[PDB]
Amino acid sequence: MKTEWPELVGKSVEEAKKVILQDKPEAQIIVLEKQAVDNAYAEYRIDRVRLAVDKLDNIAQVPRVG
């Protein structure tokens, strides 16, 4: 299944979540902005997907599992 969603970029976050669940049904779909991940916590999350959205809760960038 998928762990990256380049297809969602330019789409709605809730739909993105639907897709992400389609791919990874059990996914912990989280939200932040673009590919701006600096200030993070421990090792990868094949459980979670963070969502990089814009001011219009759309997918600004490729949201990824971990």
mmCIF file of C-alpha atoms in Angstrom:
data_model
loop_
_atom_site.group_PDB
_atom_site.id
_atom_site.type_symbol
_atom_site.label_atom_id
_atom_site.label_comp_id
_atom_site.label_asym_id
_atom_site.label_seq_id
_atom_site.Cartn_x
_atom_site.Cartn_y
_atom_site.Cartn_z
ATOM 1 C CA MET A 1 0.000 0.000 0.000
ATOM 2 C CA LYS A 2 1.176 3.665 0.175
ATOM 3 C CA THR A 3 3.072 5.634 2.769
ATOM 4 C CA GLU A 4 3.446 8.850 0.715
ATOM 5 C CA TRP A 5 0.606 10.860 -0.910
ATOM 6 C CA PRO A 6 1.926 13.142 -3.683
ATOM 7 C CA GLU A 7 -1.523 12.666 -5.291
ATOM 8 C CA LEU A 8 -3.205 14.674 -2.538
ATOM 9 C CA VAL A 9 -1.108 17.812 -2.927
ATOM 10 C CA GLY A 10 -3.619 20.516 -4.090
ATOM 11 C CA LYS A 11 -6.607 18.558 -2.610
ATOM 12 C CA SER A 12 -8.595 18.734 0.712
ATOM 13 C CA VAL A 13 -7.070 17.446 3.917
ATOM 14 C CA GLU A 14 -10.143 15.461 4.989
ATOM 15 C CA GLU A 15 -10.142 13.765 1.546
ATOM 16 C CA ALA A 16 -6.375 13.239 1.965
ATOM 17 C CA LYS A 17 -7.170 11.535 5.243
ATOM 18 C CA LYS A 18 -9.725 9.324 3.417
ATOM 19 C CA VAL A 19 -6.992 8.381 0.864
ATOM 20 C CA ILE A 20 -4.378 7.860 3.564
ATOM 21 C CA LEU A 21 -6.831 5.585 5.383
ATOM 22 C CA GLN A 22 -7.559 3.814 2.025
ATOM 23 C CA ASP A 23 -3.850 3.075 1.861
ATOM 24 C CA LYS A 24 -3.121 2.688 5.534
ATOM 25 C CA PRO A 25 -6.604 2.061 7.125
ATOM 26 C CA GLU A 26 -5.375 2.246 10.699
ATOM 27 C CA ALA A 27 -3.284 5.409 10.123
ATOM 28 C CA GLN A 28 -2.952 8.132 12.736
ATOM 29 C CA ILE A 29 -3.474 11.075 10.413
ATOM 30 C CA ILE A 30 -1.768 14.138 11.976
ATOM 31 C CA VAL A 31 -1.469 17.802 10.674
ATOM 32 C CA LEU A 32 1.300 20.538 10.346
ATOM 33 C CA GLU A 33 2.392 22.619 7.278
ATOM 34 C CA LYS A 34 4.625 21.746 4.191
ATOM 35 C CA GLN A 35 7.829 19.573 4.233
ATOM 36 C CA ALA A 36 8.921 21.605 7.297
ATOM 37 C CA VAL A 37 9.754 18.907 9.838
ATOM 38 C CA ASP A 38 12.649 19.892 12.074
ATOM 39 C CA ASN A 39 11.594 19.890 15.662
ATOM 40 C CA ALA A 40 10.636 16.155 15.780
ATOM 41 C CA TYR A 41 10.478 13.203 18.179
ATOM 42 C CA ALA A 42 12.036 9.651 17.968
ATOM 43 C CA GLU A 43 12.195 7.026 15.110
ATOM 44 C CA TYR A 44 9.704 6.596 12.161
ATOM 45 C CA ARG A 45 5.916 6.017 12.312
ATOM 46 C CA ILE A 46 4.557 3.293 9.924
ATOM 47 C CA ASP A 47 1.359 3.891 12.019
ATOM 48 C CA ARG A 48 1.032 7.671 11.589
ATOM 49 C CA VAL A 49 0.907 10.009 8.586
ATOM 50 C CA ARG A 50 1.481 13.745 9.212
ATOM 51 C CA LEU A 51 -0.314 16.103 6.912
ATOM 52 C CA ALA A 52 1.310 19.152 5.448
ATOM 53 C CA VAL A 53 -1.684 21.472 4.717
ATOM 54 C CA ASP A 54 -2.266 25.098 3.808
ATOM 55 C CA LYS A 55 -4.452 27.828 5.226
ATOM 56 C CA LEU A 56 -7.361 26.243 3.385
ATOM 57 C CA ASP A 57 -6.974 22.823 5.005
ATOM 58 C CA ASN A 58 -5.841 21.422 1.612
ATOM 59 C CA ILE A 59 -2.680 19.402 1.107
ATOM 60 C CA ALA A 60 0.010 21.880 0.551
ATOM 61 C CA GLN A 61 2.633 19.111 0.198
ATOM 62 C CA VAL A 62 3.268 15.345 0.052
ATOM 63 C CA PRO A 63 1.976 14.105 3.462
ATOM 64 C CA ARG A 64 3.970 10.978 4.527
ATOM 65 C CA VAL A 65 3.464 8.147 7.066
ATOM 66 C CA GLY A 66 6.562 8.684 9.132
#
